[PDB]
Design an enzyme around this catalytic site. Structure first.
Site, PDB file in Angstrom:
ATOM      1  N   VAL B  86       0.849  -1.184   0.000  1.00 49.28           N
ATOM      2  CA  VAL B  86       0.000   0.000   0.000  1.00 49.28           C
ATOM      3  C   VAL B  86       0.881   1.229   0.000  1.00 49.28           C
ATOM      4  O   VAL B  86       1.850   1.317   0.762  1.00 49.28           O
ATOM      5  CB  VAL B  86      -0.990   0.027   1.176  1.00 49.28           C
ATOM      6  CG1 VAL B  86      -0.279  -0.112   2.477  1.00 49.28           C
ATOM      7  CG2 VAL B  86      -1.820   1.293   1.128  1.00 49.28           C
ATOM      8  N   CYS B  87       0.558   2.153  -0.878  1.00 48.37           N
ATOM      9  CA  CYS B  87       1.253   3.424  -0.955  1.00 48.37           C
ATOM     10  C   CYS B  87       0.459   4.403  -0.093  1.00 48.37           C
ATOM     11  O   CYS B  87      -0.592   4.910  -0.501  1.00 48.37           O
ATOM     12  CB  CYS B  87       1.361   3.861  -2.405  1.00 48.37           C
ATOM     13  SG  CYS B  87       1.900   5.533  -2.548  1.00 48.37           S
ATOM     14  N   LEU B  88       0.939   4.634   1.123  1.00 44.62           N
ATOM     15  CA  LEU B  88       0.250   5.498   2.080  1.00 44.62           C
ATOM     16  C   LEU B  88       1.185   6.626   2.487  1.00 44.62           C
ATOM     17  O   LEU B  88       2.160   6.389   3.228  1.00 44.62           O
ATOM     18  CB  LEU B  88      -0.209   4.692   3.294  1.00 44.62           C
ATOM     19  CG  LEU B  88      -1.094   5.418   4.292  1.00 44.62           C
ATOM     20  CD1 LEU B  88      -2.428   5.814   3.671  1.00 44.62           C
ATOM     21  CD2 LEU B  88      -1.297   4.462   5.463  1.00 44.62           C
TER      22      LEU B  88
END
Ligand code: ZN
Ligand code: ZN
EC number: 2.3.2.23
Lengths: 101, 154
Positions: B86-88
């Site tokens: 996940v790109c958070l």
């Protein structure tokens, strides 16, 4: 003196005369959190990351704040850090402070 | 012992009193506080008919370095890849603030699930679909949630 104070980073309290008061803000930090934060910042981040781990101050975008901040932080780091990390502090400081905005 | 252990015990004691609304069934071995498992339970279509198992992996240097989140359940989302990465932004190395706590990280994750960020995607195909025709995106994501998602708790 010996009254307990909560560490602003980890949430655990120790006697205040064991804690590290950051001269630039009102946060109280325990010795272990203090040493880990500033050691990791020195070895893995930039000297602009040498700010409070709990509040992120001071604002190192004001050049008039740098001498006061780093010369006072110097003394705390000498007592806290391993000798190699304290020497790295001086090497990075000698290389200069990137001025963000 | 370590800053990570003190800090994560603090965070867990605060979550165990104030359970989080969309992050449930939190499982942490008190013998290894550096891995948390839990169930993401989204509130809005197209994800609100399923739940998603995630794992939070804290570095030994936490809170001075950020955690990483991995989805174990497959999800149809522009910012989560097929391996569950996940790109958070709030936990990117360049953005990370040690004062950030896991409850805020989860809130940020739920906001991303609710509102994809197709400008910086891990799946450019889904990001295009979300931008050009969400109704189609939403139907595709609902079916993917139905087909591969986990059962929701009560
Ligand atoms: Zn501490
Ligand atoms: Zn502070």
């Amino acid at each position: 003196g010996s009254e307990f104070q909560e560490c602003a980073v980890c949430g655990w309290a120790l006697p205040h005369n064991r804690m590290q008061a950051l001269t630039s803000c009102e946060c109280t930090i325990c010795p272990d959190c203090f040493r880990q934060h500033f050691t990791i910042a020195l070895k893995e981040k930039h000297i602009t990351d040498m700010v409070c781990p709990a509040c992120g101050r001071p604002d190192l975008t004001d050049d008039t704040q740098l001498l006061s901040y780093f010369s006072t932080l110097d003394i705390q780091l000498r007592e806290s850090l391993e000798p190699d990390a304290y020497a790295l502090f001086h090497k990075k400081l000698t290389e200069g402070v990137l001025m963000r905005d | 012992s370590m800053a990570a252990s003190r800090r994560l015990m603090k965070e867990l004691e605060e979550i165990r009193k104030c359970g989080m609304k969309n992050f449930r069934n939190i499982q942490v071995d008190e013998a290894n506080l550096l891995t948390w498992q839990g169930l993401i339970v989204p509130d809005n279509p197209p994800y609100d008919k399923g739940a998603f198992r995630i794992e939070i992996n804290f570095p030994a240097e936490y809170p001075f370095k950020p955690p990483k989140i991995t989805f174990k359940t497959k999800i149809y989302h522009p910012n989560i890849d097929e391996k569950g990465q996940v790109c958070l932004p709030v936990i990117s190395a360049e953005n990370w603030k040690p004062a950030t706590k896991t409850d805020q990280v989860i809130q940020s994750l739920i906001a991303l699930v609710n509102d994809p960020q197709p400008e910086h995607p891990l799946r450019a195909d889904l990001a295009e679909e979300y931008s050009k025709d969400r109704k189609k995106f939403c139907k595709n994501a609902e079916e993917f949630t139905k087909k591969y998602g986990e059962k929701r708790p009560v």
